[PDB]
Amino acid sequence: GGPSFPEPKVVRSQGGLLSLKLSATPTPLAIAGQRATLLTYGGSFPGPTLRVRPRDTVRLTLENRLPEPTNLHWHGLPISPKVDDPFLEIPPGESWTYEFTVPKELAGTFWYHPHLHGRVAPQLFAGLLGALVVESSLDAIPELREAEEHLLVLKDLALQGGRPAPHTPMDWMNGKEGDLVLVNGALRPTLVAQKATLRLRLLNASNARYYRLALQDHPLYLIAADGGFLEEPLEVSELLLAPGERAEVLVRLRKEGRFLLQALPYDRGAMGMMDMGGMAHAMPQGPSRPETLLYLIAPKNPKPLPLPKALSPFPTLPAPVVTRRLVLTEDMMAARFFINGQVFDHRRVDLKGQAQTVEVWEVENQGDMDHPFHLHVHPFQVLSVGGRPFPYRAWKDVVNLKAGEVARLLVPLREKGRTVFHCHIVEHEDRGMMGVLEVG
Ligand SMILES: [Cu+2]
Ligand SMILES: [Cu+2]
């Protein structure tokens, strides 16, 4: 009804249960004016959005119809690592049922994708990803209830011969970015707003591309980070979203008109190829070229809603009982990536911590590219980066580190079991930059 906007089909819980069979299968699709066979969940790119409420039961049966094994990571969900099992393999032709309960305090935007080590980057790049939304009682206050809500899945692509483009040697070093910069699987869609206040849930599901988001003539009001609400709205002129990160923003359209949502130039330290003999800046790739993500059309005579005065207070965290240091390094030409000097070994436990305690983690990027650090199972609070305070309080599960930056994270250890932490430039994860945490 009214103007259409491309957006994944939503599957909702009913009577406290979301039970769904989801097949991972090669799928011919229409895309950017052409036909391509992608790897998809549920026959769509992106996959379907699962929408639940706290205390719901999720029962998702993943049906592997791919030519290779796979698994699922429930990215950002603070559940058991015996469910969110990074070491599980589902062979081709087999199924596996993931069952869990949505925690009572959780809210925001999460996502699911493959996590079979060694094959994450080709599988995610081929199209295997979908969103998960946890509704909150806060969504009922008038300042959010009457906003026009949309999910925006930011994910680029490159095609060759009607299939996802193959990974090159440069791709394993830099991470793979595509030439088709898509929103919900569409090339530069147009959103004809019917309300003057929009609530946009944003997901960077790209392998490696960064999105320095800016809306023409408008600020963004950040109300949620990766894993939950902020304490109150935070006005920003632009918002950088690293791979794996999510955010929710309100947009207040004041004037009629058509406004571009753009991914402004950002230099994440990727490296170019060689030869040379010039006068200025080469060798690095330098900043991304600017991209138009979508066109936003404001409604007639727009009067936006007032902003909410407060959102969700952030929990007081106890004093930490241990401090950890995790140093990220790289060898670019070999395209190998390390944590404290070692590459991932699934038979090696790297950190041993205690359930029901809080730790400080100091994560130090001693490389030259941005690396976005992700910890499964245990959401954290970013204290500082580079010795300066983080700009808000909210649960995160991905923190971006530029060259030489050190992040101090407060990590409450929740569920027992064995889980992982890794760079979410998933090529780097495939090429070494992952370690194992065991909680007892
Ligand atoms: Cu992830
Ligand atoms: Cu990395």
Side-chain angles (χ1 to χ4, degrees):
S4 55
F5 176 75
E7 194 161 359
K9 195 184 307 306
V10 177
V11 169
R12 298 164 208 278
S13 64
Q14 203 105 73
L17 173 67
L18 200 164
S19 183
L20 170 61
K21 189 182 81 160
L22 207 76
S23 316
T25 81
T27 310
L29 302 171
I31 184 137
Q34 64 204 292
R35 169 201 218 253
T37 302
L38 302 186
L39 312 179
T40 67
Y41 299 118
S44 57
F45 170 67
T49 295
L50 320 185
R51 190 150 174 138
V52 297
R53 313 169 51 253
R55 303 149 91 85
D56 278 350
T57 292
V58 177
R59 285 215 274 270
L60 186 299
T61 302
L62 178 61
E63 199 177 76
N64 185 4
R65 299 294 176 261
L66 302 167
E68 51 178 299
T70 199
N71 73 12
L72 278 185
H73 172 37
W74 293 89
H75 181 130
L77 287 192
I79 57 176
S80 175
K82 342 272 198 175
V83 182
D84 189 41
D85 184 347
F87 313 99
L88 177 88
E89 293 211 355
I90 309 166
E94 305 310 302
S95 307
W96 184 261
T97 295
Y98 294 91
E99 173 153 18
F100 60 89
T101 297
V102 182
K104 43 194 72 133
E105 291 284 40
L106 193 65
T109 306
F110 305 87
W111 63 306
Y112 59 93
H113 67 80
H115 198 77
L116 197 135
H117 173 61
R119 293 302 288 181
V120 176
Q123 285 191 10
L124 175 56
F125 192 80
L128 291 158
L129 62 136
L132 190 150
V133 171
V134 179
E135 296 188 343
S136 159
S137 59
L138 249 190
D139 300 333
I141 75 185
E143 299 79 4
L144 303 174
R145 178 190 76 234
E146 300 300 320
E148 173 170 333
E149 181 190 348
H150 295 279
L151 170 69
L152 302 185
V153 178
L154 314 175
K155 171 124 193 111
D156 54 342
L157 186 57
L159 303 171
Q160 176 177 292
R163 291 169 273 114
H167 267 66
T168 72
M170 292 288 288
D171 289 330
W172 292 114
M173 172 181 75
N174 284 323
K176 191 167 186 62
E177 302 183 57
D179 63 313
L180 303 168
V181 183
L182 301 169
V183 172
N184 294 340
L187 190 52
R188 300 190 277 277
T190 290
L191 173 39
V192 179
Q194 297 214 76
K195 301 270 193 51
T197 291
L198 313 167
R199 175 207 196 156
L200 304 181
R201 303 182 187 260
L202 306 161
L203 159 64
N204 184 348
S206 306
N207 279 40
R209 177 178 293 273
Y210 281 66
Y211 300 88
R212 184 185 159 212
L213 304 164
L215 182 61
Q216 281 185 340
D217 295 318
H218 296 82
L220 312 183
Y221 299 87
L222 185 63
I223 65 167
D226 304 325
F229 285 106
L230 271 64
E231 295 195 296
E232 68 181 336
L234 181 69
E235 181 178 69
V236 297
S237 73
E238 67 181 60
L239 186 64
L240 182 72
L241 270 202
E245 291 189 309
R246 295 85 66 211
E248 312 195 1
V249 305
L250 304 166
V251 171
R252 310 181 71 252
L253 301 163
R254 293 119 177 130
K255 305 171 151 323
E256 287 165 36
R258 166 196 285 116
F259 314 88
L260 277 45
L261 178 64
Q262 289 184 108
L264 300 180
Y266 186 79
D267 182 2
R268 66 186 182 88
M271 281 308 293
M273 194 33 103
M274 206 214 301
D275 277 85
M276 321 157 268
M279 302 86 176
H281 159 285
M283 39 283 296
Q285 289 191 356
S288 55
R289 86 161 175 108
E291 300 285 347
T292 298
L293 299 174
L294 55 73
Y295 306 101
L296 179 61
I297 293 195
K300 186 45 54 100
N301 180 236
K303 34 205 71 203
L305 309 162
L307 291 176
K309 289 157 182 38
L311 295 156
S312 289
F314 188 79
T316 43
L317 287 181
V321 312
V322 74
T323 293
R324 311 223 181 244
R325 185 149 279 250
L326 299 183
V327 184
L328 315 176
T329 64
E330 56 204 29
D331 175 348
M332 289 293 283
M333 186 173 73
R336 290 294 175 197
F337 298 92
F338 311 87
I339 308 191
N340 291 333
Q342 321 192 267
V343 296
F344 173 71
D345 185 334
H346 79 279
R347 300 158 293 123
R348 182 182 76 232
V349 176
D350 303 308
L351 312 173
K352 306 185 181 241
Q354 292 195 261
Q356 307 312 107
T357 62
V358 184
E359 322 193 320
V360 169
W361 290 21
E362 290 169 13
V363 190
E364 183 180 350
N365 181 359
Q366 279 184 22
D368 295 312
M369 324 169 60
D370 285 38
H371 298 283
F373 182 84
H374 175 50
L375 171 61
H376 293 206
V377 172
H378 319 273
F380 50 73
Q381 181 195 1
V382 188
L383 307 178
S384 42
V385 188
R388 290 171 281 269
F390 207 72
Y392 57 78
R393 319 162 77 205
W395 294 113
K396 282 186 63 50
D397 50 63
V398 180
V399 57
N400 195 56
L401 314 157
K402 301 177 219 266
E405 293 191 332
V406 183
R408 279 177 51 251
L409 318 175
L410 223 35
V411 183
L413 295 186
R414 299 163 176 79
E415 300 282 345
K416 292 159 191 225
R418 185 168 301 191
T419 190
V420 301
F421 48 88
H422 62 86
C423 182
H424 218 293
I425 293 174
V426 291
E427 285 82 358
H428 295 178
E429 176 204 332
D430 277 343
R431 304 285 294 181
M433 206 181 257
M434 182 157 54
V436 173
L437 158 71
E438 194 159 65
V439 178

mmCIF file of all heavy atoms in Angstrom, residues 370-371 423 425 428 433, ligand 2:
data_model
loop_
_atom_site.group_PDB
_atom_site.id
_atom_site.type_symbol
_atom_site.label_atom_id
_atom_site.label_comp_id
_atom_site.label_asym_id
_atom_site.label_seq_id
_atom_site.Cartn_x
_atom_site.Cartn_y
_atom_site.Cartn_z
ATOM 1 N N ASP A 370 42.244 -0.485 9.462
ATOM 2 C CA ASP A 370 41.159 -0.641 10.420
ATOM 3 C C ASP A 370 40.875 -2.131 10.586
ATOM 4 O O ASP A 370 40.762 -2.852 9.592
ATOM 5 C CB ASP A 370 39.867 0.044 9.928
ATOM 6 C CG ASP A 370 39.879 1.562 10.043
ATOM 7 O OD1 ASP A 370 40.927 2.204 9.810
ATOM 8 O OD2 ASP A 370 38.793 2.121 10.332
ATOM 9 N N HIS A 371 40.735 -2.587 11.833
ATOM 10 C CA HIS A 371 40.197 -3.921 12.130
ATOM 11 C C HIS A 371 39.012 -3.777 13.071
ATOM 12 O O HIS A 371 39.162 -3.200 14.174
ATOM 13 C CB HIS A 371 41.241 -4.861 12.754
ATOM 14 C CG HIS A 371 42.412 -5.132 11.864
ATOM 15 N ND1 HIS A 371 42.350 -6.006 10.799
ATOM 16 C CD2 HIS A 371 43.665 -4.607 11.851
ATOM 17 C CE1 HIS A 371 43.519 -6.021 10.178
ATOM 18 N NE2 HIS A 371 44.334 -5.182 10.797
ATOM 19 N N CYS A 423 38.344 -10.620 14.134
ATOM 20 C CA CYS A 423 38.084 -9.476 13.277
ATOM 21 C C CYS A 423 36.868 -9.743 12.399
ATOM 22 O O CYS A 423 36.689 -10.842 11.865
ATOM 23 C CB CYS A 423 39.308 -9.170 12.402
ATOM 24 S SG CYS A 423 39.111 -7.729 11.323
ATOM 25 N N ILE A 425 36.328 -8.126 9.582
ATOM 26 C CA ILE A 425 36.635 -8.189 8.156
ATOM 27 C C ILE A 425 36.844 -9.679 7.884
ATOM 28 O O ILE A 425 37.914 -10.220 8.174
ATOM 29 C CB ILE A 425 37.856 -7.345 7.776
ATOM 30 C CG1 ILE A 425 37.550 -5.854 7.973
ATOM 31 C CG2 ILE A 425 38.291 -7.624 6.322
ATOM 32 C CD1 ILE A 425 38.757 -4.938 7.750
ATOM 33 N N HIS A 428 39.973 -11.550 6.974
ATOM 34 C CA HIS A 428 41.004 -11.607 8.012
ATOM 35 C C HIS A 428 40.725 -12.716 9.018
ATOM 36 O O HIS A 428 41.659 -13.376 9.502
ATOM 37 C CB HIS A 428 41.098 -10.257 8.723
ATOM 38 C CG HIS A 428 41.566 -9.135 7.851
ATOM 39 N ND1 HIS A 428 41.670 -7.840 8.311
ATOM 40 C CD2 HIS A 428 41.943 -9.106 6.552
ATOM 41 C CE1 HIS A 428 42.092 -7.060 7.332
ATOM 42 N NE2 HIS A 428 42.272 -7.803 6.256
ATOM 43 N N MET A 433 42.766 -14.279 12.046
ATOM 44 C CA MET A 433 42.603 -13.295 13.125
ATOM 45 C C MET A 433 41.392 -13.651 13.987
ATOM 46 O O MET A 433 40.358 -12.973 13.989
ATOM 47 C CB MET A 433 42.496 -11.884 12.561
ATOM 48 C CG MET A 433 42.952 -10.817 13.560
ATOM 49 S SD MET A 433 42.820 -9.112 12.950
ATOM 50 C CE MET A 433 44.529 -8.755 12.558
HETATM 51 CU CU CU B 2 40.908 -7.280 10.260
#
